[PDB]
Amino acid sequence: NLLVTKRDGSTERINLDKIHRVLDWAAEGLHNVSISQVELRSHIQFYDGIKTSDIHETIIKAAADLISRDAPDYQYLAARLAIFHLRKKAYGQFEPPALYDHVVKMVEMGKYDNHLLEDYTEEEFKQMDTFIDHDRDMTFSYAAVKQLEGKYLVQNRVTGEIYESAQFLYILVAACLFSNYPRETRLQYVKRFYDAVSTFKISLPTPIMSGVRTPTRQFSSCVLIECGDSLDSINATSSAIVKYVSQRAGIGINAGRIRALGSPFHTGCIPFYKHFQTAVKSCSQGGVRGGAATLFYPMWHLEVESLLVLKNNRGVEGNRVRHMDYGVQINKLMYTRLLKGEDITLFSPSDVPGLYDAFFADQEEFERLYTKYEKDDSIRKQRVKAVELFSLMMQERASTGRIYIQNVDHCNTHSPFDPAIAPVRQSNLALEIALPTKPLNDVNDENGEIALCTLSAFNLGAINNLDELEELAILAVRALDALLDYQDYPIPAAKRGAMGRRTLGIGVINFAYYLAKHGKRYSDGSANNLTHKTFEAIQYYLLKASNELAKEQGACPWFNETTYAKGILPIDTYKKDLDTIANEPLHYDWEALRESIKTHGLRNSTLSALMPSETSSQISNATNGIEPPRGYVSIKASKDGILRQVVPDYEHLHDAYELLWEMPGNDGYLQLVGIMQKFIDQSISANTNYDPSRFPSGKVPMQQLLKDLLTAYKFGVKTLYYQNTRDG
Amino acid sequence: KYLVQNRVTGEIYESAQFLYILVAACLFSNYPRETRLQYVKRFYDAVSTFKISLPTPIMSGVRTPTRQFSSCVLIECGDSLDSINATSSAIVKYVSQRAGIGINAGRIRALGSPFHTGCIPFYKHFQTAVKSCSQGGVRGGAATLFYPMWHLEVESLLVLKNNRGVEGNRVRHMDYGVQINKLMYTRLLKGEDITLFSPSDVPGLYDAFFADQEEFERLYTKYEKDDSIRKQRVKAVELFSLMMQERASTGRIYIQNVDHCNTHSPFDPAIAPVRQSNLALEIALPTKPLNDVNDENGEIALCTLSAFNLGAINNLDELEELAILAVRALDALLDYQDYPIPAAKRGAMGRRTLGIGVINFAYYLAKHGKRYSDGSANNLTHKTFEAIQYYLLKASNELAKEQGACPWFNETTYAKGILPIDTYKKDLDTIANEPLHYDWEALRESIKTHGLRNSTLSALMPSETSSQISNATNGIEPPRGYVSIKASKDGILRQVVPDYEHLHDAYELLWEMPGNDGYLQLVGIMQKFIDQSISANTNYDPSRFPSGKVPMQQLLKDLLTAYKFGVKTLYYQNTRDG
């Protein structure tokens, strides 16, 4: 007979037919999936008096355990079974209530922001309800639905109650970002932004995905703080960190200005780095989990040798600060010294006036001052062989994988900012953000500047051709620019940065997939002109949108500090060597746009940045950022069992993909990163990768490490992020 | 280890058919000329064509000058030094003859009682007793020791084979059976506490734990209130967690559901309760403690074993002829074999208990296009084990008519007209709907009238050596792989699962099973008909779980599943490695 304990708490006959129907509904249009198989694997687990919720968990998981390269459609079967379970959990039935009725109930429960009701009439919620297509829920993969349930959908943190479904999330996120638009155009903007995100064309980051529509205003997830060489500045930096990490922001810290140990910071940089570490970790569940930072400093700093080994897990405690990452800052002269097999001189910033500034802004001024101070022998200085310094850095980079590189000259010669007024002097956590900053005297110093950036991404696998990006760029820019006016700022210097420059970082996901379906690869140069073609379209259409927005709503307060303001474009300042590796011509009117920018300026000082995505791209079953996948199936752990994801359209494209370890070397990929950087305002989170088994005795030669470093330099690469080493 | 040979020169004196014919001859020697040789011919045929599988001691002994054939003994210890010593002496005696031991030592009072020093020193003693005849002190002589989950000293006892403690805290070379009932499990579900008493401080409590569940219910709650009584209180989840943890890592902390062993049993638990098992967890017989090695008031349980080869029979009515042969061959042996301890002779002549089981079940399911894990083999298992138990009962019934029932027959639930088909766990109705094909109602009456020669007939034991003889899959277990590898000084020995050629796809190899549910249901359906118990295993492949760690949630759930389907005992837990 088999009995089932219902939602409330009373038995009832088991209903095998209803279960079969739900499965049959779920399987519609899927290929290579056996309902029968899923039925057998779950029915055996049932027992007399089974809770109704656990039957759904059993069928979902049963379908999830069959996800494979051969039968990838189990991704969607399990997903739909989970959507079906979430509907019954949220609304007591499959059918979502009417939008207005739901919003009203939720605001009343304190779960949605009450301004939704103020800003929109009931008739306006009726109209918006007509934009909604709840069946779009059927288009999520299993891993996507796990993400929605884990960290997106408005839920009760303690009871585990889910209150909404994915389309309500999408419509309302549209509503809040366009709330202040004139009735004339408001709802049309809402409809088209909803469409773009619910059909995966635009990818939105976590803080926006889980927050916008709720009572919170905490959306800043990356901050850049520059430290001056004083205790007051040190403390201000520390306090700013603590503030932002309690809101979960990732930190980039420029601490290169702090004077070396032994100066007229008698005790040196490291105690202060430890302090920044504890600041970063001050809100972490145990002191490891949560809160992350990358700290930046010049390669020529007197204390550099001590600093390079800071995360070497085999030293002494007061010599080590292991739980931050580091960005070593380099320029043309340092590299030249390497090639010429010469020496590098190490100065404390304090003993070399004008030297630190020139290092970022003026390369030949740096050239002059450096050689001058190398002669002047009253100045405290250390001399080292260039090969031993680069060797040490690359060694530390190789074993931890998190000693990063920033080419400061490239960040300033090819930049949307005039390095004389607003130089770029650091990056963020993941190495794609490149914005100006100024040190603080006090946590509340209205003279300091903390850089912030709002992020999003275009899904290169959801668009059919490149002129779709016009409509999408308009939506992305205007949605994110509105957010800048919507979100809280807990530290005045950060509000300065954001309202002064209005900087955005809009990037890509699903690039590997994109190259695959165009019959191109990473490693051979076959994707060069297509990358050039693709990223030209991206940057041109982003600039156009921010330009139309400047015409509509006025340029950004500090616009006059951009190289854009002076009529200069990215197509003018890019590394010249890119001409030797791609010959795609420009397809868009960069000259009309130059003038239209000279005239009306830009709403935003930056627009583009290529960030890693991991959680975000799971939502739309996309390959992460611009990275090639490691394998066809991606495995993740969760207390709900093993979660699998199959790279998009594996069925038709398995041979088209170039999986990460199939690449003979880094050259192909570094060229694509170069070609991309031609158009990117900020930077790109590029990786270097090495399989020991491609090298004699399984040891990666330093020669190859140094060569690839110089290759990235050669093609105008601004930053180098992770180094991955294959193991096994 | 079978053929009569010179142990020292390595001379072989006989061949396999002489072994088979003569084993037939000795077991039917006392039969009347009228029928004697016909019995010999048909028993020879049955064993030489692998239909009946015989255990090692019989296979190597019967026809030789020896009379040592008992390979499993069950001894219960009372709470006194005299009983402790008697138990120890009985062990030493049987292990010098190579018997496997099951010891019930749960009655010994806890450390700190009015066994001031406690159970463990005495467990060490039983260990040394068990190992007293072992080539180095590891090789040979094995035991499982049984105790209640609610014993005051339980937390100390659960970790006894944890190889990372201190010496006087550890007794590593015995296995353990933790004894549980409905109330303990309920406490787990309800997320409540379990109270730990020493047996000595709770009169009538230990007895009820096996015989009367609602009497146990009353006394337990009573003594939980009475706060003059020495008692320890623990969270039910932490106790079960500890047990399952110890079970997971050693693989040899066992489970016995004492209520199931008594509500569904061929014995009246008021007169002769089942209170322990043997080494491998399939034997379930009554026992009584001894005052002295020679105490004619004690009872040591013994059981003679054999098996039907489910791969050598073409259909299920062949079992009639085979059951007759098996029962009569083994019942004669009971009268043929020596008994070195009087309490054991009591058990065997009083109850005449047999344990006849199966081999080649995986193979059997394979050739019927059935599998273990999906429920596809449920009605076939029901069909197969009904045939087995009905035909065994019929043979022992015809034998009772011919030679008189067993002296203590009146203590069986059989004597009262009650059958296994009356007392089985009710939840088995929700997972199989095969109807009964045999006249259980005619048999009820024919049993009410003439009784049974033997108080028990069926038990599902592991076989390893035995099934090798007839190239059979071991017992009711699915094989690990198609080829089984064994070492010997003669080189690598290989065995290929029967009819691999035609059936490789039909098999469900052990690690191909998504979980334990399918197999536990088949063990349940089997237990419906089995007199005693079954050596069932639980199995887990770490790589089917996140981070390769087996969740306690799943361990506890499967434990409760076995309980739900009337599983009496849980034996090995195997973990895949690599």
Binding site: - | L189, V237, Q553, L556, K557
Partner: peptide, 11 residues
């Protein structure tokens, strides 16, 4: 271990 997840089970 989850006592709520267990507690549903009927023995």
């Amino acid at each position: 271990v989850d006592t709520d997840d267990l507690s549903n089970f009927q023995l």
